[PDB]
Design a protein around this ligand. Structure first.
Ligand SMILES: Cc1cc(-c2cc(CS(C)(=O)=O)cnc2Oc2ccc(F)cc2F)n2cn[nH]c(=O)c12
Length: 127
């Protein structure tokens, strides 16, 4: 029933990098998703108290959302792009474990996984 604290967006002793792929990720890919008409249920952490889904965090052991992700981008939290790219995979994957296919929240996810996959087919180069 209670919510856990949100995944860390800061960490002083994690190694950090502003790689150019990575700033594509925040500047194009995240904001390409961030403003899609279905981004809202994902712009922050799932709230099992307001939604009254107590079972959520018993099922979902590694929450991700775009809220923490955008922060992590703005926090140079990442070492490269694979890291951030798999913070998206878990965001979706959680939605496909917790819910069952056909659910409206599954729809929107799938919609966003595909645009996300569209915007991360082409990524800029290195310096
Ligand atoms: C990832 C995610 C986000 C929400 C959700 C979030 C918010 C706003 S917040 C973050 O403040 O809680 C409101 N409604 C929600 O549920 C919906 C339920 C029916 C829908 F057609 C559309 C939804 F967005 N979820 C509900 N169930 N399972 C999930 O995995 C899930």
């Amino acid at each position: 029933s209670m919510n856990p604290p949100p995944p860390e967006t800061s960490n002083p002793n994690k190694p950090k990098r502003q790689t150019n792929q990575l700033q594509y990720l925040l500047r194009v890919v995240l904001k390409t998703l961030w403003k899609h008409q279905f981004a809202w249920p994902f712009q922050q952490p799932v709230d099992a108290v307001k939604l009254n889904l107590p079972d959520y965090y018993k099922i979902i052991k590694t929450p991700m959302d775009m809220g923490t992700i955008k922060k992590r981008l703005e926090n140079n939290y990442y070492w490269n792009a694979q890291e951030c790219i798999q913070d998206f995979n878990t965001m979706f994957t959680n939605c496909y474990i917790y819910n069952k296919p056909g659910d409206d929240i599954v729809l929107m996810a799938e919609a966003l996984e595909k645009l996300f996959l569209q915007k991360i087919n082409e990524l800029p180069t290195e310096e």
